[PDB]
Write a protein that binds this ligand. Sequence first.
Ligand SMILES: [Mn+2]
Ligand SMILES: [Mn+2]
Lengths: 135, 135
Amino acid sequence: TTPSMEMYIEQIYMLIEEKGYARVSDIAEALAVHPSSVTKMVQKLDKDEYLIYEKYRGLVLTSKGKKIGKRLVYRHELLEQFLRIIGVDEEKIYNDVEGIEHHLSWNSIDRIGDLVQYFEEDDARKKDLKSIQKK
Amino acid sequence: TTPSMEMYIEQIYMLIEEKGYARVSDIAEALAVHPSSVTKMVQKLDKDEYLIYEKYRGLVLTSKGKKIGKRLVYRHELLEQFLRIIGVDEEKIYNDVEGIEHHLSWNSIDRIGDLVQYFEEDDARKKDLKSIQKK
Ligand SMILES: [Mn+2]
Ligand SMILES: [Mn+2]
């Protein structure tokens, strides 16, 4: 895959999960791009077997597409949770996540998950961390 | 400064610190860019006053450029320290830092800094974190 392919797979997965389908116009709306650009990427994703077109349902993810898709959403949400946990201003988070999500190895994602769990199981840790920043 | 600009200033700052000069050939090899493209970017940085020609030394950082370069190197080093502290495979750290450093807000950088010193003040916290990775 590529960062762009992942940006699209993530968005398509989100729409199907939210609406039950992923229309070109909806994808174009979420990414602020022309539908023709969407169709070009969809053709590529079809060629690479991440999805297929079904007569009425339209765009449908293959098993490969759904598995990766769910993990891309996982990554995005974990990174948002990570930044939120360490005190980053809410207004900054989405921009930072989108800027780094496609450039962080899964090993790093794995370790970040352990870091988030670390603070999740004991608020005294979040308190000690917070005492460092305001200081 | 744009991410591309920061990428160049960071590398130029480093070359000057280690060699005393930043030759196009050394810049091109370190950034994996052809010397032709370096030349074009350097001409722009010179015009934008981030770089300036000096007798004997050649292309050097201006006061504006050196101040920025110092910040960029700080950011890179802090990010390497961060990933190393949370357990990221040593062989994957550099690529990740390289891919996220230009896309993170300074807010996130400062909060990562708080996290780094959080673990640095008590080895017990590091052990508590590693135990999570173990399981
Ligand atoms: Mn995302
Ligand atoms: Mn760097």
